[PDB]
Design a protein around this ligand. Structure first.
Ligand SMILES: Nc1nc2c(ncn2[C@@H]2O[C@H](COP(=O)(O)OP(=O)(O)O)[C@@H](OP(=O)(O)O)[C@H]2O)c(=O)[nH]1
Ligand SMILES: [Mg+2]
Length: 175
């Protein structure tokens, strides 16, 4: 994964948001990419955002799951986003409906109009993980097909499995 972002994009404009419930595995993925200097920001208290930047590829990572006063500021980070990576704990069935509701509250925002969506069915390396097609039905991702390029990619963050495919896919669909 060392540098793979660089040889893939080579400083095209690419502003990625990577979100999901806590425990889904985002920070693991962020660090696997070896993207460069992480900058852990607190735009306001109760809102921990971690941003990395390489050439022209920007990442911004935070956990969903509450604290409404910081949502007008979520929308500030939405503006100009070129791709949303939404990470899901595939092995946590009783939290899938939570994760579903938070995904739809983000992806249908007007500031994310037509935004590309990769749903990472992460922790597929745990017994009992839901399959991508299962997650598609549970999440009713068909409702987003009219206006969002989307894919569900099975990943194993701690291995890096699926992460190269994820970046290649985003790249193939971008300017
Ligand atoms: N089986 C499996 N486990 C994963 C995977 N990705 C992350 N885990 C683990 O799940 C926990 C959540 O990781 P983290 O990146 O902090 O989630 P978050 O940033 O979305 O809150 C981590 O363990 P710890 O917090 O204990 O260090 C992490 O090592 C995966 O792909 N497969
Ligand atoms: Mg984290």
């Amino acid at each position: 994964m060392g540098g793979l972002v660089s040889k893939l994009f080579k400083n095209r404009e690419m502003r990625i948001l990577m979100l999901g419930l806590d425990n889904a595995g985002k920070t693991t993925i962020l660090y696997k990419l070896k993207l460069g200097k992480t900058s852990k920001t607190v735009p306001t208290v109760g809102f921990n955002v971690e941003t990395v930047k390489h050439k022209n590829v920007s990442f911004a990572v935070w956990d969903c799951g509450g604290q409404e006063r910081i949502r007008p500021l979520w929308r500030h980070y939405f503006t100009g986003t070129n791709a949303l990576i939404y990470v899901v704990d595939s092995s946590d069935v009783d939290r899938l409906e939570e994760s579903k509701q938070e995904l739809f509250r983000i992806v249908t925002d007007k500031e994310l109009t037509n935004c590309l969506l990769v749903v990472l069915a992460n922790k597929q390396d745990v017994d009992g993980a839901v399959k991508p097609k299962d997650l598609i039905e549970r999440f009713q991702l068909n409702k987003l097909t009219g206006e969002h390029t989307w894919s569900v990619i099975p990943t194993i963050a701690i291995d890096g499995t699926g992460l190269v495919e994820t970046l290649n896919w985003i790249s193939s669909h971008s300017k």
